[PDB]
Amino acid sequence: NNPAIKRIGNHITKSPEDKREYRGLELANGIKVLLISDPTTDKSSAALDVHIGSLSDPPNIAGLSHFCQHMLFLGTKKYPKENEYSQFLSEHAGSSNAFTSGEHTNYYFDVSHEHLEGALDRFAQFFLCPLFDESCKDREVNAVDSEHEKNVMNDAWRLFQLEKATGNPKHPFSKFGTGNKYTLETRPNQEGIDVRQELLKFHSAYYSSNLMAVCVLGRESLDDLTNLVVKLFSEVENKNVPLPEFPEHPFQEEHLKQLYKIVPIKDIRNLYVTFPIPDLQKYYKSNPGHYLGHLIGHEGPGSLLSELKSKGWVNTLVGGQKEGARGFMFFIINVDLTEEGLLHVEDIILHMFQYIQKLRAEGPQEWVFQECKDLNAVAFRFKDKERPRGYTSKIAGILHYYPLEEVLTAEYLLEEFRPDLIEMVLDKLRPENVRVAIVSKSFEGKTDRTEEWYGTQYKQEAIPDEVIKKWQNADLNGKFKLPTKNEFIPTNFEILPLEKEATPYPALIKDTAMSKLWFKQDDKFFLPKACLNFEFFSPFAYVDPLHCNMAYLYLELLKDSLNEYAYAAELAGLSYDLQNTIYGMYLSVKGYNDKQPILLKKIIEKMATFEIDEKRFEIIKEAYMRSLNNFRAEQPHQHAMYYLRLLMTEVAWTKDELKEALDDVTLPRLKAFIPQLLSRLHIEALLHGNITKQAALGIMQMVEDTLIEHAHTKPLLPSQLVRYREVQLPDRGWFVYQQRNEVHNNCGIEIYYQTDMQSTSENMFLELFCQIISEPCFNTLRTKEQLGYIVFSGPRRANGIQGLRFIIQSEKPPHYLESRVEAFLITMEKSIEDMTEEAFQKHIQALAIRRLDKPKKLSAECAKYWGEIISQQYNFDRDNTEVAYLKTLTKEDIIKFYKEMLAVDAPRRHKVSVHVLAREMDSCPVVGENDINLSQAPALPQPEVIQNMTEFKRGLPLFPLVKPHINFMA
């Protein structure tokens, strides 16, 4: 029947725990579609993936596909308005984004479930009648240039492009996909090229329905979703475009047995080993590449990493297959490098081949395959319910690789044991097919080449035949042994029955001087999982820079010590996070509840009886020093946020103070520190998931008893549970702190308009206002003015206080950026006064939906509760309470709020600005003074420049702390 539908796939295989309904189908024009019905979803979404990417960019216009990606949001014939799409989503609690890879351009969005069609309609036009407006083209080009500019000094991006430039230059893999102003404007201009026309041609030539896949999720029934998609996408024209293929590998003979010495931006030491391999995508039912990745990349006893670490040459290792494109892939083994390791690269590589030889000697093991198969099946069956936006975008992409019926299970459920494929891939991991890259500052001044797109400095050399020979003659090393059965594999998945006293929110079930225990048995996800969060309070974790360094080192040494044992648990879906905080320590264990008690007990026991390995201590200390210094290489806006944090927080040690006190941390000092840190503590925990009250109480008490027995831990005094306050800015005051980024040639800025302490009314005044200015800020400061790629506005919450913040990274100086933000504020005032009552009520409804969006998985609901606990506000019913108050606000309330707290002449304006200057910028005024289609910046007063952070805080009062919400139990 239905001529618009070529076929409706059979039952879509899903997890028996997945209540969502699915329907696969292929439209007449060839678009693969997957419909998902979820009658309970608060937000609906859709995504469309075009199987064409930067690899198909015309040789003379690098980055065109990426540019087309940006341009499609800027207007269509049906919806001409430059921001009709984004504005519509914003006003309906939605969001959107997109990315471009070598063979894909993925577009996606989410929106209130009641406005799926309105959003899908505007979205579908992207692939039917884009405008590619000339004015939008000249402006948006700056956004692309700005995006590339931020990656320029990024080591990951530089290495990513260096690999492409080190392969066959004739191969499309060598293309620069990001593109910039030069390649998208300048170059084409001085070549008589009309980018507008090129975009029209590219889109017309590659945006064919036969190469498109779509996924839509909404509350509507599968039949309604079907008619919806047919009605909006069946008109996409099918030009039967051939799927681009790349059978010849970018790395040919002359590209093998090559060594590269690279100079990084940050002070890092890394060794990258790469092997060219065939495209293994078609073997998804067996995944021979992952099999080898699992073995070679194993941490755990007898692994390559274990020996490499014991020898003090490496700290971390990553192994396995890496995607390339249809026709080719790579197999890598990347490792971290210690100072000693840097001097033994040849030996490290020999060990890599010795381990590989071991795998050849033992041959493929079915029990290993069986183990991964079982774990993958368990993972799929109990997979957490995903957020719509990410789910649709992911499905749209994978619809291009798997049959409709298998789209959900394809990446999880293994079916075939293939020793023939495993051996085939292992046969490619040989010395004569290797590429080795070393990244180190020690190569500074020893390089003779430069990568054009990023300016990366490196040197290329052929690996001497004897070195290759020695690796080829790699023999068995007794230190290398295959892993043993994973004893952490879960077997008990029974869901405990909901207890009679089960509560809607966490309940305080223990309130002692030693610990405060919040508990909630899962009442909606019903998966065999649990989240155990613990907050250990101790004044000695942040008393001074030295102790902060020791707190960090201690936990870092601890995790490094448990790694081998904890890796098996990680594979079995049982992980943990352990880190030092400004108040002590934070520990979180999550995953299948079955064996959590075992891992937890092990962690605490290890914590209270830790014996530091001197060698591990020195190496980890050296890496930490490096990590502190490397912050200088972070982006300008990250620096701005960093400085503001230091400025507004009562107590905060800087990275300079920390590394300065780091040379004072000795093994003896660290050994004395640990017992001191654990001597007195207070624990506030949240146990949430598939667990009973008695199990929770049991877990909590087990942690205390372990500390008491081995560390003789005593309760902390209530008066010692200190919380830091935020600096209280004076009415009508304006302070400016200026610094310079010596790595990035871009400026960064953060403007903070402090309002008042957090509370129901104050919270919603700020949030409603941010909701109203959110899309306009982006549209004005970026799409129109093109100040930069990174343009952000939103609420800032810290230490119980809150306000409005703006974050921008640009080529333009901070004082100019600030003038534009002030001009934008004026625009928003007029805009609010000029908006209709209904438009206002629309923003209220949008914020409401955003705040009431229900978490889809346990960790997300747990995080929300944890947020209430960590902030010590414990307002578990916050969303309902705050939204009810929100729906009470009028335009007048928001106008008054603005005039009293935000306006340039506001009686209670509390403003602080952080100016981060670009590398090649000696100074910059802190304030500055046509009309161009640019609005008028209000005139600003003279700011008080901050010369010393300490003095700044001393001369200002401190806000009080927010009073807790009262939660009564025992």
């Binding site: 990606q69 984004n97 990315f99 995006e147 990513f160 990553v318 396995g320």
Partner: peptide, 13 residues
């Protein structure tokens, strides 16, 4: 560990 864990974006998250 195993490598399962590079593209361009319209907008920063």
């Amino acid at each position: 560990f195993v490598n399962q864990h590079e593209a361009l974006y319209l907008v920063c998250g």
